[PDB]
Every structure is written in C-alpha cells, then in structure tokens.
Amino acid sequence: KHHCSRNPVLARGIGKYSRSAMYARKALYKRKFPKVTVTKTVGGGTRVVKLRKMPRYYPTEDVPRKLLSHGKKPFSQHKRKLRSSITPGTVLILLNGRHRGKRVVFLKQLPTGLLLVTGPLAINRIPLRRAHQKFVIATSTKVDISTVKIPKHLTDSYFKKKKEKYSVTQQRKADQKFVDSQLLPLIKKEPQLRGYLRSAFFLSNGMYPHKLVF
Amino acid sequence: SAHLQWMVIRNCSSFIVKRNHQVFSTEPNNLKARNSFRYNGLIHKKTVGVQPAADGKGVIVVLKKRAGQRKPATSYEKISINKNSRSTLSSVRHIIRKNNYRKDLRMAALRRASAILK
Amino acid sequence: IQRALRAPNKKVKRRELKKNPLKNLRIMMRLNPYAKTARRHAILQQLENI
Amino acid sequence: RKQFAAAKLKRVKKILAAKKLRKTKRKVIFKRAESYYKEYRQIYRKEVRLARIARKAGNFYVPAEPKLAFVIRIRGINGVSPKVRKVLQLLRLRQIFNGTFVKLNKASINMLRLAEPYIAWGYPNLKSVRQLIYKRGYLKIKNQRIPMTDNSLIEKYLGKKGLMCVEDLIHEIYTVGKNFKAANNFLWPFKLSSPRGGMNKKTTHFVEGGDAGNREDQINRMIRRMN
Amino acid sequence: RLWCKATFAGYKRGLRNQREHTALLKIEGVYARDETEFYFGKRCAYVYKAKNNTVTPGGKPNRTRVIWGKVTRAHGNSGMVRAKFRSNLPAKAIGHRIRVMLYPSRI
Amino acid sequence: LRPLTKPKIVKKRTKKFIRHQSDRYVKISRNWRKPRGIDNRARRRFKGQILMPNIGYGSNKKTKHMLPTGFKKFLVHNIKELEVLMMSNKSFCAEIAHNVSSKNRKTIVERAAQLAIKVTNPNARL
RNA sequence: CGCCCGGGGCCGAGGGUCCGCGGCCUCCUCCCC
RNA sequence: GCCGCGCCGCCGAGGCGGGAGGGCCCGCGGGAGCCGCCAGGGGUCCGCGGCGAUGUCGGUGUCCCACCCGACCCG
RNA sequence: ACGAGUAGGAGGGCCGCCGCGGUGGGCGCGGAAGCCCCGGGCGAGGGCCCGGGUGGAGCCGCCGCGGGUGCAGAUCUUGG
Ligand SMILES: [Mg+2]
Ligand SMILES: [Mg+2]
Ligand SMILES: [Mg+2]
Ligand SMILES: [Mg+2]
Ligand SMILES: [Mg+2]
Ligand SMILES: [Mg+2]
Ligand SMILES: [Mg+2]
C-alpha cells in the first residue's frame, strides 16, 4: 500500500526533514531512475457513430474562459474550524432562530462545520438540529457525554431541508428518543441542571457581556 | 488592393451606421454587421455571406468567385442549404474549412447561420 | 520579409500582485532558496533550546 | 515519421536545457545565501570579540564609522530652498515619506547636512535593509517602478556585477560593495507609509526632542513604524 | 433581551468635516478602550418604525425597519466604537438606540 | 431576453452636476457651465460649494453606456437598421425611434422578436 | 519576517508557469481495521 | 610608532592536517517518470436560508420634506 | 508613472445651431417640427435618446462643405 508522508509537519509549509534526510528515510538508492467513436449495426450494413457530435446551435456571443487560480477549493473541501470552548458536552446558548436565548447541549460537529445541537427535547422542546458556531455562545458548563452513542446517519443531508407543511417524521422522533434516553440520566447527576436548560438567557439591567463570564 | 480600398471605405460608406458610439455596416456580405477590415463584405476577393433563404426556411451561403471580381452579375455563387440545424452548420463549416475560403470567417458564419435558423 | 522578422511575442504579461515575501512562505523561498533551510534550522534549534 | 520524432526531442532538449539551467543558478544563489547567512553573523561576532579585547586590557575599541545610511524625507514640498530642493532630488527623495540608502563619505554627509530639517536619517541594521527590500523593494528597469517578484529581474540588470538574487542585492546594500552605486540606483525609492505611532516634532532636530537630523541607531525604530 | 444597548453618538468627524459612512457608537457598559475588544465584529442594528409596511423575514409585514451594521474598531479611550452600516445612519438617529447583537460570537 | 453578462455597474456619482447659481435664477439653466469668475467659489473649489464635473468621475469603460438591464442602447428606424443587431444581440438592445409611426412600430417589434433582439420600448404607441 | 499561533476591519482588480512538498517508481514491520 | 620571536587572553573571529569514539547534520547520492498536495503567475463555493397579485418587491439620482455636516453674491 | 490653476496657449468633442454637396431604397396625417412632463434613461461634461401629453406638416442620422453658430451680466437693445 501507499506509505504515509514520511515528512512530519514541523510548521505550516515546512517539512521537518531535508531533501537528504528524506532520501535516507525513503531509501531512493534502491529505486531505478481515446476512442472518440463507437460502431453500431443496423438493418444498410454497419454505421459508425461519433460520441459528442457537433453542436446544433451556436450563440451570437460567447464569454471568454476565466484564468487559472489556486486555493479556491469548494465548500465541501474547506477546512473546518471549532472554538476551543466548544467541546462535546458544553451547554451552548443559541442567539438566532426561534429558539434564541435558549440553552442547548453540544453533541458533535458535522462535516460542514455546523454543530449537532440538542435540547434535549424533553427539557426545552429543542430537538436534535444543526447550529452554527458563530451564532452560539459557549458556556463553561460541560456534561460528560463520552458514553453517549450518536448514530452515524446524523449527517448534514439528514438535517437538510426537504423543501407544503413541515411535519416531524417518525425517524426524527426515534432518533430523538435514542439520544435523549442517554442524556437524561447524566443530566440528573448535575443538580439544578434540569431547570437551567429549561430557562432562557437574556440581558437584564447592568449585565454587560464584555464582563460577564459564561 | 483590399487595403487600398479599405482606406477609402474606412470612414466614408453608404453602409456605415455610426450612432450610440457604435459603427455597424449594412453591406450584404458582412457576417458580424461590423465595420471592420476583416468582416467587410465588399473589399476582399473572398467574401462569405450567410443570408436567409427566399422563403421562410433555409439559409443561403454566398461565396465570391475568384474570376467574378469586376463582373457583379456573375461574381457571387449562392448555396441554398435547407437541412437540419446540425447538418446546415456542418455544410457551412466544410464550405469554409475544406476550401480554405476565409477560414477567419468560419465560426463567424456558423454563428450567423445559427441565428438565421431561429 | 518573414526571414527577417523575429519570433512574434504572442505572450501577454500582466501586473503581478507582489505578495509580501516576509509574510508569504512560498514567495520568500522563490527569491531566497536558503530561506526554507534557515527557517527549518531556526525552529529545530528553538525546540532543542526548550 | 523520422522527422517528427527528431524534431520532437529537439524541443525536449530545449526544455531540459532550461530546467537544468535553473537548478544550476538556484544552487549558486543557495550557496551565496548560506554564505551571507554565515557572514552576517561573523561580522557581528568579530566586533564583539574586538570590543571584549579592549575592555579586558582597559583600553577602548572604537568601531568603524557606519558606511551605510537610510535617509527618510519627513517634510513636504511646500516652501523649500533651491539648494535644499536640489539635494533632495540627488537623494531621489522627491516626496514626503520616502527612503534611499546613502553610501556615507565626506561628499555625502555634507549633502545630508544641507537638508537636515527635511530629512531624518541614521544607520540601518540588517533587519532594516532586508525588510525594506523585501516588502517595499521595487526595481527601476527603464525608469519604471517594477515590483521585485523573481530573481530574473535582478540577474538581468545586475548579473554583469555578480548580483544574481535578492540576497546578492541585500549583501551589496548592507555591506557597501564595489557595485553599491548600481545596486542602490537599481532600487526604487522606498515609498514608506506615515509613522505608525506619530512623530515627536517634525520641525526640530532629533537631539532637541524632534525628528529631523541624524538618529544614529534609532532610525531602525522609525523604520519599523513606517515600513 | 439578546442585544446590548448602544447610542448613536454621531458620525466619524473632525471639527469642520463629517464622514457619514462611519458612525460612532457608545455601548452602555463599555467605558474604556480595553473593553471594546469583545464587541469587534458584532452585528449592529438601527431598528425604527415607519409609515408604510415592509416585509419581515420569518414573520408578517409591519412598520418596523432596520439598518444593519457591524462594529469595526475602537474609538478613543472612553469605550467608544466605530461601526459601518450598509446605509449611512440618518441624522435623526443621533442619540437614539442601536442594538449591538451578540453574534458573530467568539466566546 | 438576458444579456451576455450583467456585471455590477459602479457609478461614481448619480446626482446631476448643476450649474453654479442655477436655482437663484430662472434664466440660468441647470446645464453645466464652468465658472470662470475671478472670485468664484465653485471655480476655486471651496468646501461646501457645487462640484465641478471633471475627468475622474468617468464610469468604468467595461460598464460605460450600459443600460441597467445589461444591454447597450442602439437607436433603430426601420427593419434594416434592426437586422444589423441580429449578431451581438446579447450585448445591444434595440430602441425604436420617436418619429416612426405606430404602423411601422408593430413590424419592427414583431421582427425583433424573431431575431431575439430586445426592444427598450416594445409597446410604445399600439 | 526570529519561531509559532490567533483575532477584527476593508476587497477579488484581472479573465484563452515559476517556487516548495508528498505518494509511487525499493522490500518489510507496527498502530488503526 | 614599526619589524621578529615567545608567553598569555580571545562563545566557536577562526582557518588547515590527523587521531578515541559518541550523534547532529547535506540543493551529495532524486528525475526528458506517472499521481496528488499547495503560504505558489489578483475568488471562489462541485455551500445555504427566509419572502410571493390588492399588499408587498426593486428603482423612483432629477417630486416634496426632515435632520447632521459644509456653506456669505455673482460678474 | 502622473493629475492644483487665473491671465494665456494648444488639442479632442459620436457637444449644440443654420445652410450646401453627398448618403441612409432614412422618417412622417397609423401624426413631423415645436412645447410641457412628481415618466424611463445614458454621458465625467457639453448634451442626447425614449415614453406620455399637446400640436398639425414637414423632419433627421452619417461623410464632407459654408457660417450673421452657443449669453446672465455690457446704468446692453426690444418686448412682456
Ligand atoms: Mg510651510
Ligand atoms: Mg518653518
Ligand atoms: Mg448621471
Ligand atoms: Mg482673486
Ligand atoms: Mg444663417
Ligand atoms: Mg452672433
Ligand atoms: Mg438674457
């Protein structure tokens, strides 16, 4: 099989080993140094047809080709970041949406960077749904959900809007009770956390976010 | 003497239409309707003219004969092509590319023939 | 006349962005080949001094 | 068929003659850069040894007076004396906040004396020279301000003097060489920004709390805030 | 309430010149420059009411309108901040309320 | 009918350059006249006065003369002046002249619809 | 840039390679499955 | 003050030749070769949400008005 | 790379006006010129195009050509 990169990343864009150190690590001294058409048969003989025939229409004008760039990867291939305060089990605070000011429990970061967020539903009526980390305030309260098993099918396509009235399907309810049945026993170990997740967050007189510790 | 005839018809022609900062030519053998040296349809010994057919369907590829220079009655050879869109373009492409007849106006005549068929 | 002409310079060169070599690594090592070696010896020496 | 394969390898040998030619020039400027990397350190450690020698014997080791100077024009173009306005053109300082290196001699210091209220010069170190040529460094090819992106521009117009890469240009400006005149004149005047953090007083001399005049080693602080 | 109280203290100006494309906000709790760092990048909103009804995202149309902005940098040493809005703030908003949202969050 | 490309047109100034003291007098038309007075404030470009149209306000050459729809205006008077826009119809729209009758405007509109040429005044008189 | 990491603001003008690496071109071992 | 020798001091200003080993290094030994990566000749997404004909959407620069700032009448 | 400007000089104008030779198989009672417009626009500007209304018979683009060719001033002239 293809061996891994024998040059560890010392720094960004810098390899740990030189050209001569990698030559010894790889032992390079042991090394040394169409069909654009298809044929078909018919009932006057055989006809050779051409794949991708010439266009039947040409526009009056055409846009020139763009220049070649680099580093402009699509969104699916982008690097995903996550704040160090957002660890699996932290109680987040939603800022936008209908559930704004409500407190949720962070479970896992999805491949597209969005955070899998749960209420749970049995506490503050917030099901398993995505949530952006930019629109979320992470508190300093963490619950140990290392034993919580999240099913693999909870991907971004699972929470992608199906695009005439929305209705929660039986799969969403089953995946809700599968995760809630594991969070409720460990939430009860932390006293006064059942009502803390029920409560909503809001700024009162004299409370300034630049000096409030979350 | 195309370049000699160009300097006369460069800015003085009954076909030149100068307005809205644009210059268009109304000569019959112009493919882009553009008043330029290359696309001017009366200046060169080899001109390509893609006109609509006399009826509502088909195009007319007008070529300028080699010996038909100072005799306008027998100077242009018209080619009526009434086929499907893909085959009509293949005919115009072969008239220009295979004959080495104004290869610079090859795609200019294909885009004009495509607009006439609409 | 064609025998007397030069090669037609059909290559169009445009203005370059001039990325900062002090901040961009690949630009620095394009002007200074030893810059990658000095950067590597400086990081490894810092880890050795720690 | 035989002519095609023959004319094909002639194109391949043309490309092979270029890639090998690049690796040779890159290997040369690699060894020049590592030699400068070692020379820049030795020059400093030599003076430390000689200074420790004199202090050990109770004597004094007077270092050599600086040969290089970076001159920044601080005043504008309104109301300038004709003699002062002529010297500022000979230093290529035709606008406010621009810098050019000057090879210090008696014919140059007296020119810097005739324009002290309009300039703020000193003795730049190696970091100051490298940052100016890397970030603010531009080239004068045909009186055209060309940015320094590749070593081909330097080797084309300074190759006959032994300057092939940017490190050769920095080594010629910092350590004044035999080709400092052509190397410095090949660099476009550094269009510097306003001093981040503000000045002290632009109309007075640096000794009396201002900014004009000659700040011997304090010009580096001014470069960090303007570069 | 999910936004911080701020006051439109005026535009970025000198003494005889005014740059209306930049606004000076005064946050109710920020009275020092070392405290403005938390608000760098927060969404700003000038919510007001008009006569004609306008469409509301995620709701029914009403008279409420808004001009969105964002805190860009600090201003001075007394906790003032600068904000740039998609449309320059109208001069009638001087001394009125500006909602400083808690997003984009960095906590 | 959509143009070939509809870029974001940037206009450095939308207001009109009014003539100095064009409001205080009905005899002074709004058409711009460069003030040449020896003590004129606008000529000496004092702060707070009317601005002087100079080069620098010129729009981008790529988006100059482009209508808000993306096309460029071109005045036509008959069928022949319309058929020259057959090609490059993705970059120029037709505009029927004002002095042509409603009898001939119907023919120019029905012919431009066949040639996929956009008319800025398709239903003018009818 | 002396070495590394991070944050905020502003914008993407143009539109027919150079410079760094890594895997394989050599056989295996361990971790992960 | 020069010149010669000797002693001594000089992070390693240092250079040469060799010797006991220990171990840190090399644009030495890797390129007319295929594949990818990218701090590499100026931006892209092969990411996404809300709103929908009788009251809403965009424009309405040049119709009125309001406020902050600037602003004295031309020749 | 550069960009101030009176007096002044020079160039460009697909700025505008009147008339002429050409030219557009131009335009027009199915409505020309003029005039009005909280109509749509374009140009950095001179200006221009389009729409509506009014009007009732001529009018315009392009290449050249000829000027009695562009007004806020002159205690300007005439009229209101
Ligand atoms: Mg002065
Ligand atoms: Mg003074
Ligand atoms: Mg305008
Ligand atoms: Mg005066
Ligand atoms: Mg006359
Ligand atoms: Mg007169
Ligand atoms: Mg008058």
Curated annotation (Swiss-Prot), chain C:
- Where are the annotated coiled coils located? none
Taxonomically, the superkingdom here is Eukaryota
What is its subcellular localisation? Cytoplasm
Similarity section: Belongs to the universal ribosomal protein uL4 family.
Q: What does this protein do?
A: Component of the large ribosomal subunit. The ribosome is a large ribonucleoprotein complex responsible for the synthesis of proteins in the cell.
Subunit annotation: Component of the large ribosomal subunit.
Record protein name field: Large ribosomal subunit protein uL4B
Tell me the organism.
Xenopus laevis (African clawed frog)
Q: Which gene encodes it?
A: rpl4-b
Q: Which residues of the full protein are shown?
A: 302 to 351 of 401
UniProtKB/Swiss-Prot annotation, chain E:
Look up keyword Transmembrane helix and say if it applies.
Answer: no
| Record keywords | Cytoplasm, Ribonucleoprotein, Ribosomal protein, RNA-binding, tRNA-binding
**Which locations, inside or outside the cell, does it occupy?**
Cytoplasm
Q: List the disulfide bonds.
A: none
| TM region positions | none
Q: Name one GO molecular function term.
A: tRNA binding
The answer to whether keyword Ribonucleoprotein applies is yes
Picking any one GO biological process from the record gives: cytoplasmic translation
* GO CC annotation, single: cytosolic large ribosomal subunit
Name the domain of life this protein comes from: Eukaryota
Quaternary structure annotation from Swiss-Prot or TrEMBL: Component of the large ribosomal subunit.
Query: In UniProt terms, what function does this protein have?
Result: Component of the large ribosomal subunit. The ribosome is a large ribonucleoprotein complex responsible for the synthesis of proteins in the cell.
Family (UniProt): Belongs to the eukaryotic ribosomal protein eL33 family.
What is the name of the protein in this document? Large ribosomal subunit protein eL33
